[PDB]
Amino acid sequence: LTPDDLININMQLQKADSAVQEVTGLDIKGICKALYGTFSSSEKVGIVPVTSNFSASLHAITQYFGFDSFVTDMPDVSGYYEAVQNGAEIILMADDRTFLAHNLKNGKMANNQPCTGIIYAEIASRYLKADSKDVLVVGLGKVGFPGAEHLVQKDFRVYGYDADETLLERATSNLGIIPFDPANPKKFSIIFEATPCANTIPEAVLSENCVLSTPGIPCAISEELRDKYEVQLIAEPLGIGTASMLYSVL
Ligand SMILES: NC(=O)c1ccc[n+]([C@@H]2O[C@H](COP(=O)([O-])OP(=O)(O)OC[C@H]3O[C@@H](n4cnc5c(N)ncnc54)[C@H](O)[C@@H]3O)[C@@H](O)[C@H]2O)c1
Ligand SMILES: [Mg+2]
Numbered sequence: 199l200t201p202d203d204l205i206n207i208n209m210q211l212q213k214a215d216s217a218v219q220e221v222t223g224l225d226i227k228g229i230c231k232a233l234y235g236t237f238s239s240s241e242k243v244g245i246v247p248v249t250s251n252f253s254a255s256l257h258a259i260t261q262y263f264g265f266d267s268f269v270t271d272m273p274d275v276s277g278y279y280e281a282v283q284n285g286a287e288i289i290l291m292a293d294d295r296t297f298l299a300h301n302l303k304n305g306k307m308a309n310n311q312p313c314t315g316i317i318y319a320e321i322a323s324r325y326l327k328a329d330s331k332d333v334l335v336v337g338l339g340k341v342g343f344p345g346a347e348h349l350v351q352k353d354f355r356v357y358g359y360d361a362d363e364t365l366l367e368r369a370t371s372n373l374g375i376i377p378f379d380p381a382n383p384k385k386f387s388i389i390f391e392a393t394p395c396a397n398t399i400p401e402a403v404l405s406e407n408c409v410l411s412t413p414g415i416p417c418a419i420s421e422e423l424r425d426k427y428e429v430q431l432i433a434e435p436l437g438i439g440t441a442s443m444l445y446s447v448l
Protein backbone atom coordinates (compact mmCIF):
# COMPACT_ATOMS: atom_id res chain seq x y z
CA LEU A 199 0.00 0.00 0.00
CA THR A 200 1.06 3.57 -0.78
CA PRO A 201 1.07 6.19 2.04
CA ASP A 202 -2.19 7.59 0.58
CA ASP A 203 -3.92 4.18 0.68
CA LEU A 204 -3.09 3.71 4.38
CA ILE A 205 -4.45 7.19 5.21
CA ASN A 206 -7.62 6.39 3.23
CA ILE A 207 -8.33 3.10 5.05
CA ASN A 208 -8.15 4.69 8.53
CA MET A 209 -10.06 7.78 7.33
CA GLN A 210 -12.86 5.68 5.82
CA LEU A 211 -13.18 3.56 8.97
CA GLN A 212 -13.30 6.62 11.27
CA LYS A 213 -15.83 8.29 8.96
CA ALA A 214 -17.85 5.05 8.86
CA ASP A 215 -17.72 4.81 12.67
CA SER A 216 -19.08 8.36 13.03
CA ALA A 217 -21.87 7.80 10.48
CA VAL A 218 -22.92 4.52 12.15
CA GLN A 219 -22.84 6.20 15.59
CA GLU A 220 -24.95 9.11 14.30
CA VAL A 221 -27.50 6.71 12.79
CA THR A 222 -27.70 3.98 15.46
CA GLY A 223 -26.15 5.46 18.63
CA LEU A 224 -23.45 2.77 18.50
CA ASP A 225 -20.13 2.42 16.68
CA ILE A 226 -19.29 -0.56 14.40
CA LYS A 227 -17.88 -2.53 17.35
CA GLY A 228 -21.09 -1.84 19.31
CA ILE A 229 -23.26 -2.97 16.38
CA CYS A 230 -21.18 -6.16 16.05
CA LYS A 231 -21.34 -6.99 19.78
CA ALA A 232 -25.14 -6.55 19.87
CA LEU A 233 -25.67 -8.42 16.57
CA TYR A 234 -23.69 -11.51 17.57
CA GLY A 235 -23.48 -11.40 21.38
CA THR A 236 -19.70 -11.75 21.16
CA PHE A 237 -16.82 -9.69 22.52
CA SER A 238 -13.23 -9.38 21.30
CA SER A 239 -10.22 -10.39 23.41
CA SER A 240 -7.72 -9.13 20.80
CA GLU A 241 -7.52 -12.61 19.20
CA LYS A 242 -4.49 -13.44 17.05
CA VAL A 243 -5.52 -13.34 13.39
CA GLY A 244 -3.37 -14.68 10.56
CA ILE A 245 -3.98 -13.02 7.21
CA VAL A 246 -2.72 -15.21 4.37
CA PRO A 247 -2.33 -13.81 0.82
CA VAL A 248 -3.74 -16.02 -1.95
CA THR A 249 -2.29 -16.05 -5.50
CA SER A 250 -5.54 -17.12 -7.19
CA ASN A 251 -2.28 -5.25 -0.80
CA PHE A 252 -5.71 -6.73 -0.09
CA SER A 253 -3.97 -8.48 2.83
CA ALA A 254 -2.19 -5.23 3.76
CA SER A 255 -5.59 -3.50 3.83
CA LEU A 256 -6.93 -6.33 6.02
CA HIS A 257 -3.99 -5.85 8.40
CA ALA A 258 -4.78 -2.14 8.82
CA ILE A 259 -8.51 -2.91 9.23
CA THR A 260 -8.07 -5.65 11.84
CA GLN A 261 -5.59 -3.51 13.83
CA TYR A 262 -8.16 -0.69 13.81
CA PHE A 263 -10.66 -3.04 15.49
CA GLY A 264 -8.13 -4.08 18.15
CA PHE A 265 -7.10 -7.49 16.79
CA ASP A 266 -3.57 -8.90 17.06
CA SER A 267 -3.19 -9.44 13.32
CA PHE A 268 -0.26 -10.29 11.06
CA VAL A 269 0.25 -11.06 7.38
CA THR A 270 2.18 -14.25 6.54
CA ASP A 271 5.34 -13.91 4.43
CA MET A 272 4.33 -16.86 2.24
CA PRO A 273 1.10 -17.08 0.23
CA ASP A 274 -1.42 -19.92 -0.23
CA VAL A 275 -0.77 -23.29 1.49
CA SER A 276 2.71 -22.24 2.68
CA GLY A 277 1.12 -19.11 4.15
CA TYR A 278 -1.65 -21.11 5.82
CA TYR A 279 0.97 -23.37 7.44
CA GLU A 280 2.94 -20.30 8.54
CA ALA A 281 -0.21 -18.71 10.04
CA VAL A 282 -1.17 -21.81 12.06
CA GLN A 283 2.48 -22.38 13.09
CA ASN A 284 2.70 -18.81 14.42
CA GLY A 285 -0.38 -19.23 16.63
CA ALA A 286 -3.18 -17.75 14.52
CA GLU A 287 -6.52 -18.28 16.27
CA ILE A 288 -8.54 -16.92 13.34
CA ILE A 289 -7.51 -17.34 9.68
CA LEU A 290 -8.49 -14.61 7.23
CA MET A 291 -8.13 -15.36 3.48
CA ALA A 292 -9.76 -14.82 0.08
CA ASP A 293 -9.75 -16.05 -3.49
CA ASP A 294 -11.89 -14.50 -6.27
CA ARG A 295 -15.07 -16.30 -5.12
CA THR A 296 -14.75 -16.60 -1.34
CA PHE A 297 -13.44 -14.39 1.47
CA LEU A 298 -13.57 -16.25 4.80
CA ALA A 299 -12.76 -16.03 8.51
CA HIS A 300 -12.08 -19.37 10.20
CA ASN A 301 -11.85 -19.53 14.00
CA LEU A 302 -9.65 -22.54 14.74
CA LYS A 303 -10.50 -22.51 18.48
CA ASN A 304 -14.28 -22.97 18.20
CA GLY A 305 -14.65 -24.13 14.57
CA LYS A 306 -16.83 -21.21 13.45
CA MET A 307 -16.41 -20.00 9.87
CA ALA A 308 -17.76 -16.86 8.21
CA ASN A 309 -18.38 -15.93 4.57
CA ASN A 310 -17.87 -12.23 3.72
CA GLN A 311 -21.02 -11.99 1.58
CA PRO A 312 -23.76 -12.86 4.10
CA CYS A 313 -21.74 -11.18 6.90
CA THR A 314 -21.65 -7.92 4.91
CA GLY A 315 -25.35 -8.13 3.99
CA ILE A 316 -26.37 -8.79 7.59
CA ILE A 317 -24.33 -5.96 9.17
CA TYR A 318 -25.33 -3.30 6.60
CA ALA A 319 -28.99 -4.34 6.96
CA GLU A 320 -28.56 -4.34 10.76
CA ILE A 321 -27.14 -0.80 10.71
CA ALA A 322 -30.08 0.30 8.53
CA SER A 323 -32.64 -1.36 10.84
CA ARG A 324 -31.19 0.36 13.92
CA TYR A 325 -31.81 3.91 12.64
CA LEU A 326 -32.96 5.76 15.77
CA LYS A 327 -34.95 8.48 13.98
CA ALA A 328 -36.92 6.02 11.82
CA ASP A 329 -40.66 6.76 11.65
CA SER A 330 -41.72 3.30 10.40
CA LYS A 331 -40.65 -0.33 9.89
CA ASP A 332 -40.69 0.01 6.09
CA VAL A 333 -37.33 -0.85 4.52
CA LEU A 334 -36.33 -0.94 0.85
CA VAL A 335 -33.76 -3.51 -0.27
CA VAL A 336 -32.19 -2.98 -3.70
CA GLY A 337 -30.12 -5.94 -4.87
CA LEU A 338 -30.95 -9.47 -3.75
CA GLY A 339 -27.71 -11.28 -4.65
CA LYS A 340 -25.08 -12.90 -2.45
CA VAL A 341 -24.96 -9.83 -0.15
CA GLY A 342 -28.51 -8.45 -0.55
CA PHE A 343 -30.47 -11.68 0.05
CA PRO A 344 -28.95 -12.43 3.49
CA GLY A 345 -29.48 -8.74 4.37
CA ALA A 346 -33.17 -8.88 3.42
CA GLU A 347 -33.51 -12.19 5.29
CA HIS A 348 -32.12 -10.60 8.46
CA LEU A 349 -34.57 -7.67 8.16
CA VAL A 350 -37.51 -10.08 7.71
CA GLN A 351 -36.37 -12.00 10.82
CA LYS A 352 -36.39 -8.69 12.74
CA ASP A 353 -40.08 -8.20 11.80
CA PHE A 354 -39.52 -5.31 9.37
CA ARG A 355 -41.84 -4.55 6.46
CA VAL A 356 -39.37 -5.50 3.73
CA TYR A 357 -39.74 -4.25 0.17
CA GLY A 358 -37.30 -5.70 -2.36
CA TYR A 359 -36.17 -5.10 -5.92
CA ASP A 360 -33.66 -6.83 -8.17
CA ALA A 361 -33.24 -6.24 -11.92
CA ASP A 362 -32.93 -10.03 -12.28
CA GLU A 363 -36.60 -11.11 -12.37
CA THR A 364 -35.75 -14.72 -11.45
CA LEU A 365 -33.91 -13.61 -8.30
CA LEU A 366 -36.74 -11.23 -7.38
CA GLU A 367 -39.18 -14.13 -7.87
CA ARG A 368 -37.03 -16.37 -5.63
CA ALA A 369 -36.80 -13.80 -2.80
CA THR A 370 -40.52 -12.96 -2.86
CA SER A 371 -41.61 -16.56 -2.21
CA ASN A 372 -38.70 -17.86 -0.08
CA LEU A 373 -38.27 -14.81 2.19
CA GLY A 374 -41.68 -13.15 2.12
CA ILE A 375 -40.62 -9.74 0.88
CA ILE A 376 -42.90 -7.32 -0.99
CA PRO A 377 -41.82 -6.97 -4.64
CA PHE A 378 -41.13 -3.29 -5.26
CA ASP A 379 -41.90 -1.62 -8.59
CA PRO A 380 -39.40 1.20 -9.33
CA ALA A 381 -42.12 2.72 -11.55
CA ASN A 382 -44.48 2.95 -8.55
CA PRO A 383 -42.33 4.93 -6.09
CA LYS A 384 -43.22 5.01 -2.39
CA LYS A 385 -41.00 7.03 -0.01
CA PHE A 386 -38.60 5.28 2.39
CA SER A 387 -36.53 6.44 5.36
CA ILE A 388 -34.54 3.17 5.49
CA ILE A 389 -32.78 1.87 2.37
CA PHE A 390 -30.36 -1.04 1.98
CA GLU A 391 -28.57 -1.40 -1.37
CA ALA A 392 -26.22 -4.22 -2.42
CA THR A 393 -25.47 -3.76 -6.12
CA PRO A 394 -22.27 -3.28 -8.18
CA CYS A 395 -24.06 -0.48 -10.10
CA ALA A 396 -24.64 3.28 -9.86
CA ASN A 397 -27.97 5.19 -9.85
CA THR A 398 -30.00 2.25 -8.51
CA ILE A 399 -32.01 4.28 -5.99
CA PRO A 400 -34.59 6.44 -7.82
CA GLU A 401 -35.06 9.98 -6.45
CA ALA A 402 -38.82 9.51 -5.91
CA VAL A 403 -38.11 6.75 -3.36
CA LEU A 404 -36.06 9.14 -1.18
CA SER A 405 -37.27 11.19 1.77
CA GLU A 406 -35.32 13.81 3.75
CA ASN A 407 -32.67 12.54 6.21
CA CYS A 408 -33.16 8.92 5.09
CA VAL A 409 -30.52 6.29 5.77
CA LEU A 410 -28.84 4.57 2.83
CA SER A 411 -26.79 1.61 4.04
CA THR A 412 -24.81 0.24 1.10
CA PRO A 413 -21.74 -2.01 0.73
CA GLY A 414 -22.22 -1.63 -3.04
CA ILE A 415 -19.52 -0.11 -5.25
CA PRO A 416 -19.93 2.31 -7.01
CA CYS A 417 -22.44 4.32 -4.96
CA ALA A 418 -26.17 3.65 -5.37
CA ILE A 419 -26.79 7.40 -5.43
CA SER A 420 -25.02 10.46 -6.87
CA GLU A 421 -23.51 13.19 -4.66
CA GLU A 422 -26.16 15.68 -5.86
CA LEU A 423 -29.10 13.48 -4.80
CA ARG A 424 -27.23 12.69 -1.57
CA ASP A 425 -26.91 16.43 -0.82
CA LYS A 426 -30.44 17.35 -2.00
CA TYR A 427 -32.09 14.96 0.48
CA GLU A 428 -29.40 15.04 3.20
CA VAL A 429 -29.08 11.24 2.94
CA GLN A 430 -27.28 9.58 5.87
CA LEU A 431 -24.91 7.38 3.87
CA ILE A 432 -23.31 4.25 5.36
CA ALA A 433 -20.72 3.09 2.81
CA GLU A 434 -17.26 1.60 3.32
CA PRO A 435 -15.16 -0.63 1.00
CA LEU A 436 -14.08 -3.53 3.27
CA GLY A 437 -13.76 -2.88 7.03
CA ILE A 438 -17.40 -3.07 8.18
CA GLY A 439 -17.95 -6.41 6.42
CA THR A 440 -14.62 -7.67 7.83
CA ALA A 441 -15.60 -6.68 11.39
CA SER A 442 -18.89 -8.54 10.91
CA MET A 443 -17.03 -11.71 9.86
CA LEU A 444 -14.70 -11.59 12.87
CA TYR A 445 -17.37 -10.93 15.48
CA SER A 446 -19.67 -13.61 13.98
CA VAL A 447 -16.88 -16.11 14.58
CA LEU A 448 -15.86 -15.21 18.16
N1 LIG B 1 -18.18 -2.92 1.01
C1 LIG B 1 -17.92 -4.20 1.31
O1 LIG B 1 -17.35 -4.49 2.34
C2 LIG B 1 -18.38 -5.28 0.37
C3 LIG B 1 -18.26 -6.64 0.69
C4 LIG B 1 -18.72 -7.59 -0.22
C5 LIG B 1 -19.29 -7.18 -1.43
N2 LIG B 1 -19.39 -5.87 -1.71
C6 LIG B 1 -19.98 -5.35 -2.95
O2 LIG B 1 -21.41 -5.40 -2.87
C7 LIG B 1 -21.96 -5.51 -4.19
C8 LIG B 1 -22.95 -6.67 -4.27
O3 LIG B 1 -22.26 -7.90 -4.06
P1 LIG B 1 -22.92 -9.32 -4.42
O4 LIG B 1 -21.89 -10.39 -4.17
O5 LIG B 1 -24.27 -9.40 -3.73
O6 LIG B 1 -23.14 -9.22 -6.01
P2 LIG B 1 -24.21 -10.14 -6.78
O7 LIG B 1 -23.88 -10.09 -8.25
O8 LIG B 1 -24.31 -11.47 -6.08
O9 LIG B 1 -25.58 -9.35 -6.52
C9 LIG B 1 -25.82 -8.05 -7.06
C10 LIG B 1 -27.28 -7.99 -7.47
O10 LIG B 1 -27.68 -6.65 -7.78
C11 LIG B 1 -28.61 -6.72 -8.86
N3 LIG B 1 -28.71 -5.44 -9.59
C12 LIG B 1 -27.82 -4.91 -10.45
N4 LIG B 1 -28.25 -3.71 -10.92
C13 LIG B 1 -29.45 -3.46 -10.36
C14 LIG B 1 -30.46 -2.38 -10.41
N5 LIG B 1 -30.28 -1.29 -11.19
N6 LIG B 1 -31.57 -2.52 -9.65
C15 LIG B 1 -31.77 -3.60 -8.87
N7 LIG B 1 -30.90 -4.62 -8.77
C16 LIG B 1 -29.74 -4.60 -9.48
C17 LIG B 1 -28.14 -7.87 -9.72
O11 LIG B 1 -29.24 -8.45 -10.43
C18 LIG B 1 -27.55 -8.83 -8.71
O12 LIG B 1 -28.48 -9.86 -8.36
C19 LIG B 1 -20.77 -5.67 -5.12
O13 LIG B 1 -20.48 -4.38 -5.66
C20 LIG B 1 -19.63 -6.11 -4.22
O14 LIG B 1 -18.35 -5.74 -4.75
C21 LIG B 1 -18.95 -4.94 -0.84
MG1 LIG C 1 -17.60 -2.88 4.39
Ligand code: NA
Binds near residue numbers: 415417
Ligand atom coordinates in the same frame (compact mmCIF):
# COMPACT_ATOMS: atom_id res chain seq x y z
NA1 NA D 1 -24.17 0.24 -5.96
